[PDB]
């Protein structure tokens, strides 16, 4: 974005810089280990309230 002004004139050179830098990392683990003991011809249970 450059402009020109024919009516005025700045003194010297100015640079006015600005820097920004960012780094990030993440790591989520979630583990489950479930046992159940049961029988071969096991049927469901109907309680359900």
């Amino acid at each position: 974005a450059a402009t020109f002004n024919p009516t005025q004139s700045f003194l010297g050179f100015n640079i006015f810089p600005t820097l920004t830098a960012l780094e990030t990392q993440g790591l989520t683990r979630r583990v489950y280990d479930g046992n159940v003991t049961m029988q071969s011809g096991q049927r469901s249970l109907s309680a359900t309230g």
């Binding site: 920004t20 960012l22 780094e23």
Partner: protein, 49 residues
């Protein structure tokens, strides 16, 4: 009748439910700001350099 009127066993069943949970947290962060001639440097964790 003699077979349908017999003594049947009486039992006591014990159930134990256990639950143990553990936590551990560890934070660490430096957050500074340096000013020397003309320069202004700021380092943080949210924003970087």
């Amino acid at each position: 009748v003699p077979q349908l009127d017999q003594v049947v066993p009486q039992i006591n069943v014990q159930v134990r439910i256990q639950e143990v949970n553990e936590r551990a947290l560890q934070s660490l962060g430096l957050n500074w700001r340096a000013t020397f001639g003309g320069f202004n440097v700021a380092v943080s964790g949210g924003t970087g350099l």
